[PDB]
Amino acid sequence: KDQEIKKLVDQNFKPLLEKYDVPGMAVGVIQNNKKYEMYYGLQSVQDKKAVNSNTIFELGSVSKLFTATAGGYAKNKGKISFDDTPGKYWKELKNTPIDQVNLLQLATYTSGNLALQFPDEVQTDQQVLTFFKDWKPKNPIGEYRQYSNPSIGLFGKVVALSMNKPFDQVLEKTIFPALGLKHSYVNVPKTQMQNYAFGYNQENQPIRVNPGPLDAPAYGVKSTLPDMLSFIHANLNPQKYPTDIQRAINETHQGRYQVNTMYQALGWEEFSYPATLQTLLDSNSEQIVMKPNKVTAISKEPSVKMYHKTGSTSGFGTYVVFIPKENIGLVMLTNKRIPNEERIKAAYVVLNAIKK
Numbered sequence: 001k002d003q004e005i006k007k008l009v010d011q012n013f014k015p016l017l018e019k020y021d022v023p024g025m026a027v028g029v030i031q032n033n034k035k036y037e038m039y040y041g042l043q044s045v046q047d048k049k050a051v052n053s054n055t056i057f058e059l060g061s062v063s064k065l066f067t068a069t070a071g072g073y074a075k076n077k078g079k080i081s082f083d084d085t086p087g088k089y090w091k092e093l094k095n096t097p098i099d100q101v102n103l104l105q106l107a108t109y110t111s112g113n114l115a116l117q118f119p120d121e122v123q124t125d126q127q128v129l130t131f132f133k134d135w136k137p138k139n140p141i142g143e144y145r146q147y148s149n150p151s152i153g154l155f156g157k158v159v160a161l162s163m164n165k166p167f168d169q170v171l172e173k174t175i176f177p178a179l180g181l182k183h184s185y186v187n188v189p190k191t192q193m194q195n196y197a198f199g200y201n202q203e204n205q206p207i208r209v210n211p212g213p214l215d216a217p218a219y220g221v222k223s224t225l226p227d228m229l230s231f232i233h234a235n236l237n238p239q240k241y242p243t244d245i246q247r248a249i250n251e252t253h254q255g256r257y258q259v260n261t262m263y264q265a266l267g268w269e270e271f272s273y274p275a276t277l278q279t280l281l282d283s284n285s286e287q288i289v290m291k292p293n294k295v296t297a298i299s300k301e302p303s304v305k306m307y308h309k310t311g312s313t314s315g316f317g318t319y320v321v322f323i324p325k326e327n328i329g330l331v332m333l334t335n336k337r338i339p340n341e342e343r344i345k346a347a348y349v350v351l352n353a354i355k356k
């Protein structure tokens with residue numbers, strides 16, 4: 001019964017606040033089109049402001065799901081193609097070597113040579129433009145997955161160029177409204193700053209995300225629990241949404257390659273359902289997240305799929321998971337990072353106990 005969802009989240013999520021000294025947490029569940037919101041603790045320790053439905057959290061790498069979506073929207077408005085190259089859109093890179101990698105390989109982290117972060121050195125628009133002009137290849141393109149902010153960041157910049165709008169306006173004026181999101185931002189306006197949580201570092205000091213190269217497309221979206229539940233809703237039921245955005249969403253669900261049990265989609269990670277706990281943990285292992293791994297063609301096309309994505313900034317943790325054919329999903333938002341494995345497991349227990 002409905003009356004168990006609250007209890008299961010208290011048993012599995014609530015203990016984490018004490019175990020990691022997390023000030024504030026928002027956990028959302030959606031099941032059979034009914035939304036449940038559970039709020040714990042404080043958005044701001046110093047203000048004694050409680051987490052609530054208005055609280056804005058940093059999504060970290062969960063922002064990549066929005067970037068992927070924006071990319072799917074542009075592929076279906078004819079504005080780009082995933083076999084295309086950066087040159088067609090960033091006039092300044094037309095024939096250089098990074099005008100050899102495709103928009104898909106960028107989005108899915110399999111260029112020869114891109115790490116997790118730009119070098120600290122790189123910051124201005126001209127330092128990014130020049131980091132990619134004097135970019136030179138390395139690995140057999142397409143063969144190796146290495147998870148990367150620059151790669152999908154560059155995908156994002158290009159998606160934005162094709163729609164003739166800077167990336168931030170593509171999300172706030174086009175993508176967010178089409179998803180019906182009311183309080184999701186690349187830049188949080190002044191009128192909403194009172195709702196923007198403090199994040200907290202491992203020294204429990206209050207912090208928020210710092211400006212960085214191509215931050216908006218790689219990790220720069222902020223949102224509320226209601227909005228993320230609406231995003232999960234749309235992923236679970238894109239039939240009700242405008243046809244452009246429906247097509248964008250389905251585009252982000254298509255698996256592109258395997259790295260072992262993990263299928264890489266656009267933004268999302270995909271698994272065969274039901275998946276074992278360990279399968280889901282492996283997607284966030286040092287092996288998968290930090291090191292290169294060789295990518296194989298999809299062999300088993302799972303009949304029933306599930307999808308997840310973890311995300312962090314220095315001050316915030318996020319996890320989102322959904323299973324289309326159970327018509328369920330879960331969103332966890334914290335204003336202190338906790339281990340990825342702890343996010344994945346609590347969600348696992350909750351969604352299996354409800355799978356009834």
Ligand SMILES: *[B]([O])([O])[C]([C]N1[C]=C(C2=[C][C]=[C]C(C([O])=O)=[C]2)N=N1)[N]C(=O)[C]C1=[C][C]=[C]S1
Pocket residue numbers: 060061062149212219310311312313314315
């Ligand atoms: B995304 O969440 O996958 C992506 C990569 N990233 C960085 C971290 C992390 C883990 C421990 C500590 C820190 C810290 O204090 O900075 C970060 N987890 N996943 N996120 C980002 O690149 C966003 C950031 C930009 C600057 C710092 S994190």
